[PDB]
Amino acid sequence: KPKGALAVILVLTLTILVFWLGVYAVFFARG
Amino acid sequence: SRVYEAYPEKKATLYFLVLGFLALIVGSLFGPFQALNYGNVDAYPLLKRLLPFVQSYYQGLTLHGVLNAIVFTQLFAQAIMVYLPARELNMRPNMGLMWLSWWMAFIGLVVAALPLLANEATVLYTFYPPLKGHWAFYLGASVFVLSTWVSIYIVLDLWRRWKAANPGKVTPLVTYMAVVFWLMWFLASLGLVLEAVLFLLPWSFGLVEGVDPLVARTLFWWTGHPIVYFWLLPAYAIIYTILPKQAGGKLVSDPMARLAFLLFLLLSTPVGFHHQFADPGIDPTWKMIHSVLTLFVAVPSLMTAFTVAASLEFAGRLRGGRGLFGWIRALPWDNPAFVAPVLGLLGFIPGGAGGIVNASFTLDYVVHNTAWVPGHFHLQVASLVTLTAMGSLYWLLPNLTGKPISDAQRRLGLAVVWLWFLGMMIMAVGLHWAGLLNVPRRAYIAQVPDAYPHAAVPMVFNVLAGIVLLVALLLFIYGLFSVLLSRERKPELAEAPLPFAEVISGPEDRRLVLAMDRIGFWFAVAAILVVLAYGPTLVQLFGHLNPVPGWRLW
Amino acid sequence: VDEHKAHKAILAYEKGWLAFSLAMLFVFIALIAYTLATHTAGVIPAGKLERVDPTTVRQEGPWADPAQAVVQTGPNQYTVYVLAFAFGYQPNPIEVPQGAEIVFKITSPDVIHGFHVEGTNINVEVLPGEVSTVRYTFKRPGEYRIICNQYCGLGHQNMFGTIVVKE
Ligand code: HAS
Ligand code: HEM
Ligand SMILES: CCCCCCCC/C=C\CCCCCCCC(=O)OC[C@H](O)CO
Ligand code: CUA
Ligand SMILES: [Cu+2]
């Protein structure tokens, strides 16, 4: 089972989420 | 040698690559000065002494964007996506068309360059009307880009000849990638060609009095999104079909590689309103539709992340790496051809994350036209695409020249690639963070030193990046000229095969590949999506043209 | 074979990853659709083509007298006619009441400018010959800086304006 590949797509997923939810919050704070 | 008589495509490929790298060097000279500017340090009085033709920050920025993002990227795409499919099929491209394409690119570049250098086209690489450049700029740019239509013909020719000599067989993987790449580029290129031919050329010659800036921008961004996938896909071709062998492994899936490239054919062009979320006169409904389609263009790269990581893990295991992270240590970190694209892929994670924010319609109002955007795109083109190009010098240059890489040149290459990656990562922090503090892009901010006090900490990151990348560029220049001007030659390096990776196959794979090999059908679907995505808005805009006079404000 | 088992195990996980990927993007589309149904969506430019002649906008019409640029158009609504030009904004300052809906109608007599109000989601391109219409309600009184964030020529980095929001 490709544990290593899964670790990479876990790090990608968290990066996308921190970026997207961070700016979603900023959008409401400035709205 | 007798090598260029048997394989004349090697000499033409080299001419593309070297013209590309020379453009990268001259464009990149301005980078560190721009980073020092985003650090509140004005080094332009020093630059003007070195290069007295430089009149302004904005003229340097025009040269930076045009030479790095338009010239170097196109010449690299023309070199890789003609030469690799030629070598996979072991067939000679039409060498008349191949030399013609090079001469077009060379003449267009010289003609565009003259007004840029003389301060007659300080309009930046987007050249948004009604800022009115010299006619030679638009003519040169037009001839430069049209070079690629000859490149499309050359590869459709190679593919046609191959299928004729091999009826019933599926397209080989690299040739498949290049065919869908060049057909996507044909559709993509029409926005800018229509903008140049209908508006910019007649306007700059004095034949029409004005241009409609909203129609001009709409046509520009038809080409302006898919041009960044045009930059990206030659690096993806190398990462899929060559990197796995260099890592000591195999491509884990041919069909998953083909699917990603097919999705780019379908989804790369019909999305350009993600550059126009802040434009008046375009229906929000169409913005929401382009937004949704933009999130779908991310899927092939989400897929690429898994297929490539799985391929590198496989290579790590084969080489005795054990555990969650031992496969990483087992990879050839001593080989600059391996390291460069892998560091590029690491920076592409935050790079892609910023792209998905940018795509999400209302979230774009937070970051639009701030330092965020240059932060995002330096991770994509200035790091992954550029590092993958720099890595190619270690396997591709010997294959074209018979010039070997000494162990010392290898060691220098590792230093260059690490410093380049680290500099881009440091600059990304400074620009993303300055962007969220509302610092604008495209601004000589060092000339208003009191305007952005809240950004003092991110500005330290920009100075540091400025210095690191100045050192990386100087080492890159020393190293490139070392390889080119070295007198030692070994001809049978030039006769060796390219390091194409093997593929793991499955029972599944043949059914999926035949479905994907219906390229006439898939191209038709891609063309209809462009018509549906753009047609209604362009009918509305062309019905209500409001041309306005041109201005020179430099 | 070892390799045959890897192809199978890799594709198995890859199919879950793709399902999770699509699910995530669909959730992002739902969260964007939400923002379009709230007051925060007023910062999206009107999709209407409102054509003007950039050569007469300083001579005739609602942009010709900046001192009469703020107009009550509703019971808690003001319309502001803003000119973005090389290299400034008129009126300067823009004076509006806290808590009212402000309809900004922005045009340029020359080249493309940006209209970015520091501390808000107001971030709109201003094209000559076209009117950019956006809506916003200021919650806090004070001074908000307007930044030109589109390259408009050599004066770009000094092109600033002021909005004053009165209690
Ligand atoms: C090559 C160049 C570029 C690529 C690729 C690119 C990708 C995206 N971009 Fe972008 N971009 C935008 C959205 C996207 C989206 C949704 C993607 C997607 O295609 C991105 C998907 C990518 C991913 C989801 C990342 C996948 C991660 C991978 C593949 C890494 C895996 C790592 C591995 C395998 C390593 C493992 C190894 C070990 C050793 C562990 C938007 C809006 O939607 C704007 C306008 C914003 C504004 O307001 O102006 C924009 C603006 C730009 C501009 C500026 C234009 C200008 O001058 O005004 C440029 C030049 C640019 C370039 C590029 N951009 N972009
Ligand atoms: C030493 C390397 C580099 C450094 C330090 C650097 C730095 C910068 C900075 C700070 C900006 C933003 C300036 C502004 O908005 O006013 C910029 C703009 C840009 N850079 Fe780079 N850069 C480098 C290399 C590259 C490369 C390799 C590419 C593409 C292959 C590239 C493409 C761009 C583009 C397209 C722009 C935007 C131009 C525009 O807004 O009109 N850069 N660069
Ligand atoms: C396997 C489990 C299956 C279950 C799947 C569930 C996933 C749903 C995700 C997101 C919900 C969207 C929430 C929409 C509500 C938005 C509220 C909001 O953001 O409000 C903040 C702001 O203050 C307002 O003005
Ligand atoms: Cu107005 Cu920049
Ligand atoms: Cu785009």
Residue numbers in the entry:
A (entry chain C): 4 to 34
B (entry chain A): 9 to 562
C (entry chain B): 2 to 168
Publication text:
Data were collected from LCP-grown microcrystals of CcO at BioMAX using the 3D-printed flow cell. The sample flow-rates were adjusted to achieve a similar velocity for the sample as it passed through the X-ray beam, and were 0.3 µl min−1 for 100 µm- and 1.2 µl min−1 for 200 µm-diameter glass capillaries to give a downwards velocity approximately equal to 0.64 mm s−1. Serial crystallographic data yielded an SSX structure of CcO to 2.12 Å resolution, which compares favourably with an earlier SFX structure determined using XFEL radiation (SACLA, Japan). Nevertheless, studies of X-ray induced damage at low temperature suggest that metals such as iron are sensitive to an X-ray dose as low as 40 kGy, and CcO from T. thermophilus has been shown to be radiation sensitive.
Proof-of-principle demonstrations of the practical value of the flow cell for SSX data collection were performed using microcrystals of the integral membrane protein cytochrome c oxidase from T. thermophilus. This enzyme belongs to a large family of terminal oxidases, which accept electrons to reduce molecular oxygen to water during cellular respiration.
